[PDB]
Amino acid sequence: MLTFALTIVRHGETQYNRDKLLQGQGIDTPLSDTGHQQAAAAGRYLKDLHFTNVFVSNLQRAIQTAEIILGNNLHSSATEMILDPLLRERGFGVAEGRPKEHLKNMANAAGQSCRDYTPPGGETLEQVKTRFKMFLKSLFQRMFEEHGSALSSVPSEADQPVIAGLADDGAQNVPVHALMVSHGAFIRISVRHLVEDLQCCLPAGLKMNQVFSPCPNTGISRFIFTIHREESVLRATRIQGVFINRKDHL
Numbered sequence: 001m002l003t004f005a006l007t008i009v010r011h012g013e014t015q016y017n018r019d020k021l022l023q024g025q026g027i028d029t030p031l032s033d034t035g036h037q038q039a040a041a042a043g044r045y046l047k048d049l050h051f052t053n054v055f056v057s058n059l060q061r062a063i064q065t066a067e068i069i070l071g072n073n074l075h076s077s078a079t080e081m082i083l084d085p086l087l088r089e090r091g092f093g094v095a096e097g098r099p100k101e102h103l104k105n106m107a108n109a110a111g112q113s114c115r116d117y118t119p120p121g122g123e124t125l126e127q128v129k130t131r132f133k134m135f136l137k138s139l140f141q142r143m144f145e146e147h148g149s150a151l152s153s154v155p156s157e158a159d160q161p162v163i164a165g166l167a168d169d170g171a172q173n174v175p176v177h178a179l180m181v182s183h184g185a186f187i188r189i190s191v192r193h194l195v196e197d198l199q200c201c202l203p204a205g206l207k208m209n210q211v212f213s214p215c216p217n218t219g220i221s222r223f224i225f226t227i228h229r230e231e232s233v234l235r236a237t238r239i240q241g242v243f244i245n246r247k248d249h250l
């Protein structure tokens, strides 16, 4: 009954990103000069889209990116930025602020692979995914409550959106449109949840290696959700991937 677009953007570069140090929930660094530039370029790229809703993590690097994107936007000045701590980066505990290479050493020393390993004080992959699941539940409820004017009884075929390599791909006739600004590990985990764990459609020519790749700073992804209410429970009946980790603006 409600169809809405979700655009997902990773925050712009920090000095930690540049120096390849792990950045989680505890070190609240700002954008570097490079990050400010990347955020402005993403803001210019998305400037002609109306974001009816905006959600950002509580972390400064993400808040700044969201602020720059909205400042550059030509349609969304009345949209409030909602801070949601559920969008924070995966926690890395004692590994945070150490070279990403140190995490690999810790994994090795502990006998597990980089994928199985969670450092002390850190979050496991399932814990991060649970946060995204909670975010989705909150997102659906908020979109549904606010966009009664957009609700429709008309069902469609799971055919492909128009993807022309432009900023509005897949959203040309989708007026309800949320922006989500978050973090690389969180987004990667979230994308895999959407694609693998849920019923999901992916367009012609999109390689799975791309779908599951790490997101660059200000890399942009897009999904279209169709949600239904049954027994007062909201559920996604269709999730359509449009593009993943796009960085044409860079």
Ligand SMILES: [K+]
Pocket (backbone or CB within 6 Å): 194, 195, 196, 197, 198, 199, 200
């Ligand atoms: K699936």
